[PDB]
Amino acid sequence: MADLELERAADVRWEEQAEISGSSLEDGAYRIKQKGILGYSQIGAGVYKEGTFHTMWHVTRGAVLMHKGKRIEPSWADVKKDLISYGGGWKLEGEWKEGEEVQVLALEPGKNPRAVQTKPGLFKTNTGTIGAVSLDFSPGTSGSPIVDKKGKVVGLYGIANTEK
Numbered sequence: 001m002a003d004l005e006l007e008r009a010a011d012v013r014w015e016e017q018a019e020i021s022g023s024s025l026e027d028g029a030y031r032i033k034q035k036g037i038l039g040y041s042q043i044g045a046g047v048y049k050e051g052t053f054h055t056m057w058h059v060t061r062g063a064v065l066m067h068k069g070k071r072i073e074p075s076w077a078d079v080k081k082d083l084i085s086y087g088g089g090w091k092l093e094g095e096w097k098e099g100e101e102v103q104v105l106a107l108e109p110g111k112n113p114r115a116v117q118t119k120p121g122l123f124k125t126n127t128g129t130i131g132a133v134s135l136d137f138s139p140g141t142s143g144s145p146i147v148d149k150k151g152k153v154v155g156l157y158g159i160a161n162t163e164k
Protein backbone atom coordinates (compact mmCIF):
# COMPACT_ATOMS: atom_id res chain seq x y z
CA MET A 1 0.00 0.00 0.00
CA ALA A 2 1.63 3.23 -1.25
CA ASP A 3 1.31 6.11 1.29
CA LEU A 4 -0.11 9.05 -0.75
CA GLU A 5 -0.63 12.36 1.13
CA LEU A 6 -1.98 15.79 0.02
CA GLU A 7 0.01 19.03 0.78
CA ARG A 8 -1.51 22.52 0.12
CA ALA A 9 1.00 24.60 -1.91
CA ALA A 10 -0.91 27.93 -2.32
CA ASP A 11 -4.25 29.63 -3.18
CA VAL A 12 -5.55 29.30 -6.80
CA ARG A 13 -5.69 32.86 -8.14
CA TRP A 14 -4.80 34.69 -11.38
CA GLU A 15 -1.65 36.91 -11.00
CA GLU A 16 -1.45 40.28 -12.86
CA GLN A 17 2.39 40.47 -12.64
CA ALA A 18 2.87 36.78 -13.35
CA GLU A 19 5.77 36.41 -15.83
CA ILE A 20 5.03 35.86 -19.51
CA SER A 21 5.53 33.64 -22.60
CA GLY A 22 8.59 31.33 -22.56
CA SER A 23 11.59 31.14 -20.17
CA SER A 24 10.06 27.92 -18.61
CA LEU A 25 -8.55 20.90 3.55
CA GLU A 26 -10.43 24.06 2.38
CA ASP A 27 -9.67 24.92 -1.30
CA GLY A 28 -6.44 25.52 -3.29
CA ALA A 29 -3.64 23.75 -5.19
CA TYR A 30 -2.19 20.66 -3.40
CA ARG A 31 0.93 18.65 -4.29
CA ILE A 32 0.44 14.81 -4.33
CA LYS A 33 3.23 13.13 -2.29
CA GLN A 34 4.09 9.45 -1.85
CA LYS A 35 5.91 8.24 1.27
CA GLY A 36 9.19 6.48 0.33
CA ILE A 37 12.06 4.80 2.23
CA LEU A 38 14.43 7.23 0.37
CA GLY A 39 12.18 10.17 1.32
CA TYR A 40 8.93 11.99 0.35
CA SER A 41 8.40 12.36 -3.44
CA GLN A 42 5.90 14.53 -5.43
CA ILE A 43 4.35 12.61 -8.37
CA GLY A 44 1.43 15.00 -9.05
CA ALA A 45 -0.48 18.25 -8.39
CA GLY A 46 -4.20 18.55 -7.64
CA VAL A 47 -6.93 21.20 -7.39
CA TYR A 48 -9.42 21.37 -4.46
CA LYS A 49 -12.79 23.00 -5.44
CA GLU A 50 -16.15 22.71 -3.59
CA GLY A 51 -14.84 19.94 -1.28
CA THR A 52 -13.86 17.79 -4.31
CA PHE A 53 -10.20 16.93 -5.14
CA HIS A 54 -9.30 16.78 -8.89
CA THR A 55 -5.98 15.29 -10.19
CA MET A 56 -4.64 13.18 -13.11
CA TRP A 57 -5.37 9.41 -13.09
CA HIS A 58 -1.63 8.55 -13.53
CA VAL A 59 -0.54 10.66 -10.51
CA THR A 60 -3.05 8.99 -8.09
CA ARG A 61 -3.45 5.80 -10.19
CA GLY A 62 -6.74 5.31 -8.21
CA ALA A 63 -4.83 5.00 -4.89
CA VAL A 64 -6.53 6.45 -1.77
CA LEU A 65 -5.34 9.94 -0.70
CA MET A 66 -4.49 10.84 2.92
CA HIS A 67 -5.31 14.48 3.91
CA LYS A 68 -4.76 15.50 7.59
CA GLY A 69 -6.04 12.62 9.79
CA LYS A 70 -8.84 11.77 7.28
CA ARG A 71 -8.50 9.45 4.25
CA ILE A 72 -9.86 10.51 0.80
CA GLU A 73 -11.79 8.05 -1.48
CA PRO A 74 -12.23 8.55 -5.29
CA SER A 75 -15.83 9.12 -6.49
CA TRP A 76 -15.27 9.21 -10.29
CA ALA A 77 -12.39 8.67 -12.75
CA ASP A 78 -11.75 8.58 -16.53
CA VAL A 79 -8.52 6.75 -17.59
CA LYS A 80 -8.80 7.76 -21.31
CA LYS A 81 -9.15 11.46 -20.30
CA ASP A 82 -6.49 10.93 -17.52
CA LEU A 83 -8.76 12.56 -14.86
CA ILE A 84 -9.55 11.32 -11.30
CA SER A 85 -12.20 12.87 -8.95
CA TYR A 86 -11.91 12.33 -5.16
CA GLY A 87 -14.89 12.64 -2.74
CA GLY A 88 -17.37 14.04 -5.31
CA GLY A 89 -18.27 14.44 -9.01
CA TRP A 90 -15.94 16.60 -11.22
CA LYS A 91 -16.60 20.26 -10.13
CA LEU A 92 -14.42 21.95 -12.85
CA GLU A 93 -16.66 22.92 -15.84
CA GLY A 94 -14.55 26.02 -16.71
CA GLU A 95 -13.75 26.38 -20.45
CA TRP A 96 -11.02 28.29 -22.37
CA LYS A 97 -12.19 31.15 -24.73
CA GLU A 98 -9.63 29.77 -27.28
CA GLY A 99 -8.57 33.36 -28.12
CA GLU A 100 -6.99 34.58 -24.85
CA GLU A 101 -3.82 34.11 -22.77
CA VAL A 102 -3.93 31.76 -19.74
CA GLN A 103 -1.88 31.44 -16.53
CA VAL A 104 -0.55 28.07 -15.37
CA LEU A 105 -0.26 27.82 -11.55
CA ALA A 106 2.83 25.54 -11.83
CA LEU A 107 3.77 23.56 -8.68
CA GLU A 108 7.06 21.86 -9.66
CA PRO A 109 8.47 19.42 -7.05
CA GLY A 110 10.84 21.11 -4.55
CA LYS A 111 9.96 24.55 -5.99
CA ASN A 112 7.63 27.36 -4.78
CA PRO A 113 4.31 27.72 -6.70
CA ARG A 114 4.51 30.33 -9.50
CA ALA A 115 2.00 31.62 -12.09
CA VAL A 116 3.29 31.90 -15.71
CA GLN A 117 1.26 33.72 -18.45
CA THR A 118 1.44 31.90 -21.86
CA LYS A 119 -0.83 31.47 -24.93
CA PRO A 120 -1.77 27.79 -25.54
CA GLY A 121 -1.02 26.36 -29.01
CA LEU A 122 -4.18 25.53 -31.01
CA PHE A 123 -4.62 22.44 -33.20
CA LYS A 124 -7.60 20.64 -34.79
CA THR A 125 -9.17 17.34 -33.51
CA ASN A 126 -12.22 15.23 -34.52
CA THR A 127 -14.04 16.05 -31.21
CA GLY A 128 -13.15 19.80 -31.44
CA THR A 129 -10.33 22.37 -31.72
CA ILE A 130 -8.08 21.82 -28.62
CA GLY A 131 -5.55 24.23 -26.99
CA ALA A 132 -2.16 22.71 -26.06
CA VAL A 133 0.02 24.17 -23.26
CA SER A 134 3.53 22.55 -23.39
CA LEU A 135 6.42 23.49 -21.02
CA ASP A 136 9.64 22.04 -19.51
CA PHE A 137 8.36 21.60 -15.93
CA SER A 138 9.36 18.36 -14.12
CA PRO A 139 6.92 15.35 -14.49
CA GLY A 140 5.76 15.81 -10.85
CA THR A 141 4.18 19.12 -12.05
CA SER A 142 1.40 17.12 -13.81
CA GLY A 143 -2.11 18.14 -12.63
CA SER A 144 -1.04 21.79 -12.10
CA PRO A 145 -4.16 23.97 -12.65
CA ILE A 146 -4.50 26.27 -15.73
CA VAL A 147 -6.72 29.37 -15.18
CA ASP A 148 -8.21 32.05 -17.51
CA LYS A 149 -8.31 35.89 -16.92
CA LYS A 150 -11.46 35.14 -14.82
CA GLY A 151 -9.28 33.00 -12.45
CA LYS A 152 -11.41 29.84 -13.15
CA VAL A 153 -9.58 26.50 -13.77
CA VAL A 154 -9.68 25.93 -17.63
CA GLY A 155 -7.44 22.86 -17.45
CA LEU A 156 -4.94 20.63 -15.58
CA TYR A 157 -1.26 20.65 -16.71
CA GLY A 158 -0.65 17.54 -18.86
CA ILE A 159 -4.89 18.98 -23.03
CA ALA A 160 -6.90 22.26 -22.59
CA ASN A 161 -10.23 21.71 -24.40
CA THR A 162 -11.45 24.89 -26.19
CA GLU A 163 -15.21 25.63 -26.03
CA LYS A 164 -16.36 29.11 -27.17
Ligand SMILES: NCc1ccc(-c2ncc(OCC3CCNCC3)nc2-c2ccc(-c3ccoc3)cc2)cc1
Binds near residue numbers: 081
Ligand atom coordinates in the same frame (compact mmCIF):
# COMPACT_ATOMS: atom_id res chain seq x y z
N1 LIG B 1 -1.62 12.77 -19.59
C1 LIG B 1 -1.84 13.82 -20.62
C2 LIG B 1 -3.10 13.59 -21.45
C3 LIG B 1 -3.53 14.67 -22.25
C4 LIG B 1 -4.73 14.53 -22.96
C5 LIG B 1 -5.44 13.28 -22.86
C6 LIG B 1 -6.67 13.18 -23.62
N2 LIG B 1 -6.63 12.32 -24.64
C7 LIG B 1 -7.67 12.22 -25.51
C8 LIG B 1 -8.87 12.96 -25.33
O1 LIG B 1 -9.99 12.73 -26.20
C9 LIG B 1 -11.16 13.62 -26.19
C10 LIG B 1 -12.38 12.83 -25.68
C11 LIG B 1 -13.43 13.79 -25.03
C12 LIG B 1 -14.65 12.98 -24.53
N3 LIG B 1 -15.17 12.12 -25.69
C13 LIG B 1 -14.21 11.23 -26.41
C14 LIG B 1 -12.93 12.01 -26.86
N4 LIG B 1 -8.90 13.87 -24.31
C15 LIG B 1 -7.76 14.05 -23.46
C16 LIG B 1 -7.84 15.05 -22.31
C17 LIG B 1 -8.84 16.10 -22.38
C18 LIG B 1 -9.05 17.06 -21.36
C19 LIG B 1 -8.24 16.92 -20.22
C20 LIG B 1 -8.41 17.85 -19.07
C21 LIG B 1 -7.39 18.33 -18.25
C22 LIG B 1 -8.03 19.10 -17.27
O2 LIG B 1 -9.45 19.14 -17.49
C23 LIG B 1 -9.69 18.31 -18.61
C24 LIG B 1 -7.25 15.82 -20.05
C25 LIG B 1 -7.05 14.87 -21.12
C26 LIG B 1 -5.01 12.16 -22.15
C27 LIG B 1 -3.81 12.35 -21.39
